[PDB]
Amino acid sequence: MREVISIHVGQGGIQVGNACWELFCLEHGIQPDGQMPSDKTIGGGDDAFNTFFSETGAGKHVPRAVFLDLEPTVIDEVRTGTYRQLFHPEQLISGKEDAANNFARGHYTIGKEIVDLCLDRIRKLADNCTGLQGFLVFNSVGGGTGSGLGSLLLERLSVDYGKKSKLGFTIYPSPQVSTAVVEPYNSILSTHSLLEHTDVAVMLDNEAIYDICRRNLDIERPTYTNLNRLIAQVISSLTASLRFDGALNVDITEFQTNLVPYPRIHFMLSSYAPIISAEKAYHEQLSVAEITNSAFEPANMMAKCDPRHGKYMACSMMYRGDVVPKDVNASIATIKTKRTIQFVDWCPTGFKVGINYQPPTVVPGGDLAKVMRAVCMISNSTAIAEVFSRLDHKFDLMYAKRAFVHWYVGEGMEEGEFSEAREDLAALEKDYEEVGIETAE
Amino acid sequence: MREVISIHVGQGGIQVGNACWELFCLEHGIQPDGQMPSDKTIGGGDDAFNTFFSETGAGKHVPRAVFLDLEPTVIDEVRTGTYRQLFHPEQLISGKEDAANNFARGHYTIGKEIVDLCLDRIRKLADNCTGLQGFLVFNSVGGGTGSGLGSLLLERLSVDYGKKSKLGFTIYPSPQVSTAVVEPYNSILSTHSLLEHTDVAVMLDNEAIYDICRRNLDIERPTYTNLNRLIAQVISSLTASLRFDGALNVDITEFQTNLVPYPRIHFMLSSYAPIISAEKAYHEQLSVAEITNSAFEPANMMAKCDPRHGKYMACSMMYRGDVVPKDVNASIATIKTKRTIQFVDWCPTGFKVGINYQPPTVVPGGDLAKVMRAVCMISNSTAIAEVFSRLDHKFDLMYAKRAFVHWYVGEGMEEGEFSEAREDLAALEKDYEEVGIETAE
Amino acid sequence: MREVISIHVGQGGIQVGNACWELFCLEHGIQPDGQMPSDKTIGGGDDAFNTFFSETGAGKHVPRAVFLDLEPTVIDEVRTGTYRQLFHPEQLISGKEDAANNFARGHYTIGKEIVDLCLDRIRKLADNCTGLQGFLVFNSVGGGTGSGLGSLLLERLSVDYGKKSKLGFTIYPSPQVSTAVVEPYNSILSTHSLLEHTDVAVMLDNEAIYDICRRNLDIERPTYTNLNRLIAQVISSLTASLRFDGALNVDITEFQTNLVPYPRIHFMLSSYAPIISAEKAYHEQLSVAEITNSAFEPANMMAKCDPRHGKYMACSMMYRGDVVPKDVNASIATIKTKRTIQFVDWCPTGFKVGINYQPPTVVPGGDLAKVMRAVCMISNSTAIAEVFSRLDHKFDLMYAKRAFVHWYVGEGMEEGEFSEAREDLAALEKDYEEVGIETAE
Amino acid sequence: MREIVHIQGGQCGNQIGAKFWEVISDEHGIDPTGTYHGDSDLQLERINVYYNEATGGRYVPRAILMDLEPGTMDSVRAGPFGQLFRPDNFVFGQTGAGNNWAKGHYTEGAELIDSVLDVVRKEAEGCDCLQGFQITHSLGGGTGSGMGTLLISKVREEYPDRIMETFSVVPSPKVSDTVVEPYNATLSVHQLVENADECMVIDNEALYDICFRTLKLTTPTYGDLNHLVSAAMSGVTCCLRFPGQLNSDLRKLAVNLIPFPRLHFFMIGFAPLTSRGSQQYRALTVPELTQQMFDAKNMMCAADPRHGRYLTASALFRGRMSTKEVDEQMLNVQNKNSSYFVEWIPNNIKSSICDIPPKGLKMAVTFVGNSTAIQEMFKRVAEQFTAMFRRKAFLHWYTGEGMDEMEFTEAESNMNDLVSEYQQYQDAT
Ligand SMILES: [Mg+2]
Ligand SMILES: [Mg+2]
Ligand SMILES: [Mg+2]
């Protein structure tokens, strides 16, 4: 009735996915094998797990998500891991020789190799599904298939269904921290082929995960376990409406042309809170106002792009748990109140409340403390264009020096893809350039 | 009342038979000696085993089938095997010196040697039987008697009874995989002498068995055990109506001039499913729609001839188990729905439902997983003529070079049998050529 | 009523011609001797073959085209070939000693030798013809008469009739692949004497033929057979309107001052599709949109000059077969849609539809697969000036070194022809330089 | 008898009239052969005012063929009902205009006008009290307009009393089937604003929109489209062809439609338009079809009544109903959206009814109203003309015909003058 499905790519990406399905399975508490601890009573009023966990004729409830990546080592760990009763073989599609972070390889070269298997799996699930709203696709501009092969993936999947929503979680090159140097190539080559195949998607950067887990989670020494846990929470709440009763169970498609008013600049930030320790869970109270005012801390901004340097457009503060329409509401007045913040005035307010009544659940072994209320500030501003500009300037020079270009030209891409894709970020620079212009008079 | 009887020939062929009677005996669970584990209660409403397993005055229930082949080594293994209490001596007729894959030998040369014994056995069984509908005949264009001696076999048996149905299971030369090179000779020499002595029959190719067992059964390294098991399933379900309650217990004679509308091109495909693993039995649900939509996967097509290259004519999706007329029915609408598929339009729909209520039984030690529902897509299209054309072109040149011809001319066949039999596939090429023509205006 | 006639020159050139008349004769299926397989019914509404195949008082229907070249070996192969019943002796005029790729030789030296015979033949055909629209002239800047003698040919033929259209098919020096090194001399000496004697003409380069036949036709190892076949298709469709019913049977003269708006820069590209294999004919669908969007692939650009580096001016996507005005029409909106493409804005749209209802016919033994719809993107942009610039810079230095000049000065050309012809490409460089300038304000 | 004639050029229009006479044949139920096989004399009563009996009852059209290349002549010559024609009128060309309008207007324009105007004139003597004649081409090129311009000039002089109701295809704003369109168009429209008596706009994209959305059709061609338009252009003479409790002819129409002679570019609406299932959704009422009548989506022209204002509006009804309904919906609608009704034209809606609808349907509706929304149309096309005329893009194909540019200025400030003219009439009260 209300389905979504997750797709996983790139090393960090399927790392995220593993964390996620660990999470949801924890949260509906269905045991890793595929059974719930106890029988399910027959009831109505709304869906349940049925969105994602797959009903069998018995205690076998597998996700509705798919793995695809050409670097097949790690995924085997899932193939080995505790959830080897959880998942399902045909759920698993991997490539042996990954891209080597040639975008053009797993996009072009090895792009040709596994696509059809992917699409068949998609047809099996969507055919298995009925009211699948949209598509959860995860990848990374690092684990190279996460850029290339995913690029073809949406490039064709969109042309397959279209009417489904594109739920885009991919990681963005951290501003000064990194993984490689061809990242310019991965990213921008992705981007010009990303945009028109993307509906909307958010940009998760890691350095924020570090700084904030270390200060706010009080973390001393983190890694992808903590990161994947954190994105696990954020996606855990970004879709609760289709999973749990909330006052305004807003929906993705609902979000689509309302958060991203124009068609073009359709990405965003997301600073979840309240992430605190057990020793800050106590020694604190964690007000709605604390999560709320705290929600707009630029230093809390969960992607390393200063909001205060940008002007907000929309903010879908979907809330978990014991939320009051009034209290949050006045907090939103407080958000109108913030002098430092500046909004795409031709969109004076574009707010859209989310009050889901389940407060958050915590993952044992985790660092986040337990609370009563969650916020997701999926918000869109002018600010985020800048780091892009860093990307196209860095890539600008490096590409000017023809660095690495032999690698890609060797695999079947043309140079005008490069300069033209730079025209692509040129245009989007005109977009964040223009939409931020205040309409005259 | 409703009898059929099986005939077995050629090395692979009686391999198939062994698998089959192993199967059915398993499925009615009558112990290999000839007894059931327990007494049989007196009841009415329909037949039982009595079709094939032969009632004694005691726990001795032998098949109603016959072995005939001139390569008598392997059959002895049955003569030795566990079922040496099962079968019956006079059930066993073999030749010592087989054909050497001279069609003309066990058809002509040794053709003369065992025929009368065969016919006497047939008279003993059919005289033993009452409402024997038709004839299960198994052979192979490889284990050479499977072509030659079987060719005489139907050639005369048809002229004996006629009114019985001809149930034809024989194997066809795999498209690029093979067993020999005289296969052209075996096949086509069979074919011109096959057709007018055949009622209807299906063409099982192996390479599909391999590819599909290895992907769909998840098989790593198969052989005739797996193959013979698989055909064991398909024949296991192609006759359930006469064995088990189903909503529309369709019958062979019913199938005859309805599936194969014209008289001539009276063969077909058969892609059974659902063949999956124990780890795909779980991690899956196996919907009626999954078996159904899955039933028409050209890549699932259980004989290496692309359906998508042909235009379907009929499809008898007889079903095992908990089937719903409605659900399947709408799936058949879905089959009308398939743009890629194209039907002999002058036969707009020719469908014929089969909903037998027993879901499938599994053979221990097997690779197929257990399910609730079976499909047999005995369907007939235009596509299958092509591989024939390969057969007559291959054979065309090889025969043009007079290759091996000394072998056959040495045994009492004339050359006009060769060129004329090529006229035979000429005509049938005109048949698949013509019936596929869309009737004008 | 609507006649055209073909002229053939240069080794590759008459190679092209042979492929062509092979083609058309195949396509109207008139047997190589000169007869149709069957009688022709009397009807009206439009012309037929009568354009080119020449009516006799019997089954003798010869082309309306002429061979002229001073390298007479190969043409004899036509003089010998299967179509020695097809063609006609006086259709054949050749020179013995060709130019040795002295432009100045077969243009000057041997230029004097066969002209009158040519013109007499032309008078015989045009006098034989009535509503001959224009002139099909084929030659090559390689098979040296293809440059020189053709240069005189149009130089005088234009001054003979004038009012006929000049249909120019000649080959252009591939950008990095070549045939000789005097090619600069051949080309530019042709060009200054080409332009003002040319109406309009297209530039076919080979390397595209290679790359695209090898990828798109899936060709492993091609030659002039494949090339000549390919140009055979493109010319096969560039004139269908005068041969077959189409919705908008546009005409050459119609094309003339509309595609090439100004008088000067009156050449163009031409990327025909859909060229695919039998294994891509299946495994594909080949939409109008696929041919259409595919039609503007710069990598599909059938002459090695990047469209994306130029700005389009006109595009006459004449279509073969089952075309829809609407569907293509919206595709043309899609072409307006393409951000990367940029048009001579003072010609905002200059489009001109062609929807001829006959889908393509295929030549047996060919590599192209069969389809339902053809496109010819005769389009004109700014891009093509560059490779010219390579030609005048290469030729610039080589001529600066006086290389080979003794060869030409030996045959009766003056140096100011060289420097001045360089002024010619100077001017045309000003033309592609200027027309691409966007008109101010 | 108020009989009329047809003349068609035009890359399409030559096909259009083919469909048209085809349709009229159906409404007269006469065989393709040319004899009547119908069931009422009423088809024969007023048959002449389009047709012509022949010795032996060959029943023939009063049509005139324009073309610069015989292919169309063969095409319709290959046409069903082709035996219903007169071989005389197959007046075509040996060249084609190439759609440089000067080519089809001077070059071939002056080349083949004579044989046409002669034989046409022989038709003029064949006409007893000629109400008029129907011309057809397109307003973007020369395949029709090339010569049709000369037609309107010549016959217009030759018959300064006859009605000239002119339909020619307008280039849609989006899809440019040719880029020389602004120039042919502008040069023509200069003429047509002066010389043509009636004009109605012929877009393709509207016809697509009708076929795809409101027809719910996926496969567009011309022929269906000409079915959709020759439906209306066939309706127009119905009263003139058949009785009507409320009749109005083209003279009553135009004189009852136009305030000032520069306004005979009219938009069109015809209906009903359903796919097959629709009747099992809905039924037919006068108020219903009315509820289609003022539909921008039936507004088959590039102008928007939703953006412009109805200078005029009218309804052509064929069927059997109660006018007591008809008027009532009329006035009702003239109120309901009064704002798009121009003000000082009281009762700017006007009425009609034909005792018989077209064949197959029980009631007929037609709307040829005239707002002034077309201003965006001329503004666009003039704009593109402006751009490339800044560039002189393809002037060389043009001046090669030996026209002047000052003519281009003439139709230019001309056509702008007509636009602003419509501006003041729209902007007034
Ligand atoms: Mg990887
Ligand atoms: Mg044997
Ligand atoms: Mg030569």
From Swiss-Prot, chains A, B, C:
Taxonomic superkingdom: Eukaryota
Signal peptide coordinates: none
Subcellular location as annotated: Cytoplasm, Cytoskeleton
GO cellular component, one term: microtubule
A Pfam family recorded for this sequence: Tubulin_C
PROSITE patterns linked to this entry: TUBULIN (PS00227)
Protein keywords: Acetylation, Cytoplasm, Cytoskeleton, GTP-binding, Hydrolase, Magnesium, Metal-binding, Microtubule, Nucleotide-binding
Residues with N6-acetyllysine modification: 40
Needed co-factor(s): Mg(2+)
Reaction(s) the record says it catalyses: GTP + H2O = GDP + phosphate + H(+)
Post-translation changes: Undergoes a tyrosination/detyrosination cycle, the cyclic removal and re-addition of a C-terminal tyrosine residue by the enzymes tubulin tyrosine carboxypeptidase (TTCP) and tubulin tyrosine ligase (TTL), respectively. Some glutamate residues at the C-terminus are either polyglutamylated or polyglycylated. These 2 modifications occur exclusively on glutamate residues and result in either polyglutamate or polyglycine chains on the gamma-carboxyl group. Both modifications can coexist on the same protein on adjacent residues, and lowering polyglycylation levels increases polyglutamylation, and reciprocally. The precise function of such modifications is still unclear but they regulate the assembly and dynamics of axonemal microtubules.
InterPro entries to which the protein is assigned, alphabetical: Alpha_tubulin (IPR002452), Tub_FtsZ_C (IPR008280), Tubulin (IPR000217), Tubulin/FtsZ-like_C (IPR037103), Tubulin/FtsZ_2-layer-sand-dom (IPR018316), Tubulin/FtsZ_GTPase_sf (IPR036525), Tubulin_C (IPR023123), Tubulin_CS (IPR017975)
Residues reported to bind Mg(2+): 71
Enzyme Commission no: 3.6.5.-
GO molecular function, one term: hydrolase activity
Primary role: Tubulin is the major constituent of microtubules, a cylinder consisting of laterally associated linear protofilaments composed of alpha- and beta-tubulin heterodimers. Microtubules grow by the addition of GTP-tubulin dimers to the microtubule end, where a stabilizing cap forms. Below the cap, tubulin dimers are in GDP-bound state, owing to GTPase activity of alpha-tubulin.
Subunit details: Dimer of alpha and beta chains. A typical microtubule is a hollow water-filled tube with an outer diameter of 25 nm and an inner diameter of 15 nM. Alpha-beta heterodimers associate head-to-tail to form protofilaments running lengthwise along the microtubule wall with the beta-tubulin subunit facing the microtubule plus end conferring a structural polarity. Microtubules usually have 13 protofilaments but different protofilament numbers can be found in some organisms and specialized cells.
Protein family according to the UniProt entry: Belongs to the tubulin family.
Name of the protein in question: Tubulin alpha chain
Curated annotation (Swiss-Prot), chain D:
Molecular-function GO term, any one: metal ion binding
Protein name: Tubulin beta chain
PANTHER family xrefs: TUBULIN (PTHR11588)
Gene designation per UniProt: BTU1
Keyword Repeat found: no
GO annotations of cellular component type: cytoplasm; microtubule
Subunit description: Dimer of alpha and beta chains. A typical microtubule is a hollow water-filled tube with an outer diameter of 25 nm and an inner diameter of 15 nM. Alpha-beta heterodimers associate head-to-tail to form protofilaments running lengthwise along the microtubule wall with the beta-tubulin subunit facing the microtubule plus end conferring a structural polarity. Microtubules usually have 13 protofilaments but different protofilament numbers can be found in some organisms and specialized cells.
Additional detail: The sequences of the two genes coding for beta-tubulin are identical.
Keywords, in A-Z order: Cytoplasm, Cytoskeleton, GTP-binding, Magnesium, Metal-binding, Microtubule, Nucleotide-binding
Main location: cytoplasm
Positions that bind GTP: 11, 69, 138, 142-144, 204, 226
Localization (cell): Cytoplasm, Cytoskeleton
Function: Tubulin is the major constituent of microtubules, a cylinder consisting of laterally associated linear protofilaments composed of alpha- and beta-tubulin heterodimers. Microtubules grow by the addition of GTP-tubulin dimers to the microtubule end, where a stabilizing cap forms. Below the cap, tubulin dimers are in GDP-bound state, owing to GTPase activity of alpha-tubulin.
Source organism, top-level taxon: Eukaryota
PROSITE patterns on file: TUBULIN, TUBULIN_B_AUTOREG
Cofactor(s) for this UniProt protein: Mg(2+)
